[PDB]
Structures are given as C-alpha cells and as structure tokens.
Amino acid sequence: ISEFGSSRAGDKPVIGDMPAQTAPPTTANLNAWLNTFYAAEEKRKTTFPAQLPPDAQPFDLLVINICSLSWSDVEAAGLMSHPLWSHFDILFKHFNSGTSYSGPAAIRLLRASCGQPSHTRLYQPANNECYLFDNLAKLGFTQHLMMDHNGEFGGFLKEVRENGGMQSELMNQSGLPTALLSFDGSPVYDDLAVLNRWLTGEEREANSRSATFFNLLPLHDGNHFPGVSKTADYKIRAQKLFDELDAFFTELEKSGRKVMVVVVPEHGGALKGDRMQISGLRDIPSPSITNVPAGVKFFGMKAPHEGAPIDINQPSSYLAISELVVRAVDGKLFTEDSVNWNKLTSNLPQTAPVSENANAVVIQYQGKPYVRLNGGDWVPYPQ
Ligand SMILES: [Zn+2]
Fold first, then answer.
1. CA 379 to CA 9: how far, in whole Å?
2. CA atoms of 333 and 75, how far apart (whole Å)
3. What's this chain's function?
C-alpha cells in the first residue's frame, strides 16, 4: 500500500518475508537489521497437517544433501550445461545454504520446517515442529539415514543425530563398491550403488511412505581414486556424480514409484578462490560459497512436469524446501490428472541470504556483501 492508499477495516499488518534495508549501511544499522531478521525468522514455520486424509497417497521423499557444491563451483568446473540441471522440475537459482561447514548445514536442513536460526541456536534443542523428518515420521513416513561415507570425520554423524535429531541407524554399507578414498582415509562409496540399494529396499516395502536423508561426500577436498596420490580433479568427480544422479533418475522413472527427490547442497567447495579466501578455504561463508544449486524432481506422477525446470529466482533457503514437502505430503499431486505447476511453485517462502559459522556472519545489505567477525564491526566482504 502506497502513501495515499488505504488498508481495509480489520486488515492484519502485512509481514514481509525479508526485512527492509532502507537505513544507511552503518554497523549499528546492519546489527539492527540482523536482529530484525532473527526476530522475523523465529516466527516462521511450515504447518504440517494434524494427520493425513484417508485418501492420501503414499510416496517416498529422498533428500540428497551434497557436500562442497555451489553454483560458483559448477561454473568454475564448466558443468553448467550438464544434462542433470535440465532434468529437475524445480530449480532454485538463489538458494542460500546459510553456512559454509558441513555439520551446521546438515542441521539447518534437518530443521527446515522453521525459520533460520543463529548459529548459536543450531546447537540447542529446537521446537519439535522444526524437524522436517520428525514432522514426516508423525504422519507415518518411515525415516532412513543413508550416507556414501561413515560420518566419522568432524563428528558429522554425531551432529546429525544429536542436533539434527535424526535418531536412525545408518543404512547398511557392507558390500558397496568404493569410488574414492576420503581426505581422512576412509571410503566414499559409489553413489549409484548406494541409491540402487535404497531403491531395492523401498521396492521391498510396497505402498509404504518413507523419508530418507542421504549425505554425499565425493566432492569434498582431498578425495582421491584408490591408489592415486593426487586429489581427484573436482570436475571429474562432479561429472561422475552428476552422471550417476542422472542414471539414477532414469532408474527411478523406470520403476514407476512415486518419489519426491530434493537435491540440496550443504555449501560450496570454494573451487574458485577470491581476495580473502584462497581456493579451498571456506571459513567465511561468502555468497559464492553459499549460493547452491537446489532442485526438486517428482517421479511417478500421473501428469509429470514437461519441459525445462521451473526456475525459482527469489532469495530462498531451507524453509522453501519444507513448504514444497508440505504441499506434497498428502501425495495427491501424484495422482492429479492435471497439476497447477504455477500454484505449486508460487508464494514459496523467501529468505534473506544470511550465512553463519561460529565466528562469522555474512549478509547482503542494499545488494552488497558484508561480514561481521565475532560480533564486532561490519566490514565489506572484499569479493
Ligand atoms: Zn560439507
């Protein structure tokens, strides 16, 4: 409503998804903006239904959470035209991962059903309604945890269990082929083999509903082919991963199963360095590191999406993934003769691109990036 417009009697105040940035960019104003962002975010949640309707349709949710993959990395690797990108139904162009470290990224994704917390708040219990997989478990979705690695490094599996709330045994990894040896010496299993094992298991369950969290490490720095001294080239590993995901999408299409696949990277690999951070360093969660390619694809729909993916251009983060899940949770979109793809992809929650690690916050303010180290004065991020 403009200055000489009127609201209607009884109108609620309109709550914007992103707090305004009209004040000049001083330390005090950027500090105040961040506190305003935290306040607004803490009031945001996806509301799941109390129970599924009796005519709900079972399907499987598979969340594919990829370490060390940002749009900047895809560009630097020369992989923007890989066929995988064109295979999604929905593709986010300004999805912010909120952090540049793996543990906090996974916790943020597991807490996708509420607005974005400060880094501090990630490591304290959240409201039960914030845990996406718990919301689904409540509605009868079997929970699965899957990885292409053992989760030992960095206490990652412990963080997923303790702070992410995912209290499920790691799916059996015995007999899987090894694709890489990790920077810590342990195996990174072949992703197509992990996904095919998942697909056989789900196929054993029938018209079950299930929700799987799958974390993938092949793009992490320091990974090598067994016996090879040098770190495998990033673009070779990324091509291999994208070819395996595309092959799996083909397998999923052939299966006829109803599946919602969400691909959401944790954070970038810092393949292309910048003034402050040489290639591979990611202690500051810069815009390049945190703008990641998130996508959604539906399989087994009576009326599948045709043509190129629907681009979501607005600033987004995990809350938008949770909203797409609740829009799908009754399974009815899978059996509709005609889907309103506009409505399905419109009015998704927008989230300002704020990113944090324990010691640093990065924001965009009036279109420019700033960093705050340990609660001190804001400084322009040097890009
Ligand atoms: Zn990671």
1. 44
2. 34
3. Required for cellulose biosynthesis.
Report d(CA 257, CA 199) in Å as an integer. 9
Q: What is the CA radius of gyration of the chain?
A: 21
Distance CA 115, CA 113 (A): 7
304 CA to centre of ligand 1 in angstroms: 32
Resolution (A): 1.5
Q: What is the rounded distance in angstroms from the CA atom of residue 162 to the CA atom of residue 67? A: 19
Residue 117's identity, in one-letter code, is: P
CA dist 186 and 17 (Å) reads 43
- The residues spanned by each domain of the chain are 1-383
158 C-alpha vs ligand 1 centroid, how far in Å? 15
The rounded distance, in Å, linking the Cα atoms of 148 and 189 is 5
Q: Under DSSP, is residue 364 helix (H, G, I), strand (E, B) or coil?
A: strand
In the block, tokens 């993916």 appear at 309
Residue pair 375/339 in contact by the 8 Å Cβ criterion:
no
Q: After which residues is the chain broken (C to N over 2.5 A)?
A: none
Nearest to 112 by CA among 286, 298, 325: 325
* Token pair of 128 as six digits: 């039960």
Cα–Cα distance for residue pair 382/288, rounded to 1 Å: 12
Give the DSSP H or E segment for 214.
strand 210-216
Kindly list the distances between the CA atom of residue 172 and the CA atoms of 73, 148, 161, 299, in Å, as whole numbers in the listed order. Answer: 31, 10, 17, 25
Instruction: Tell me how far the alpha carbon of residue 267 lies from the centroid of ligand 1, in angstroms.
Output: 6
| CA 316 to ligand 1 center in whole angstroms | 19
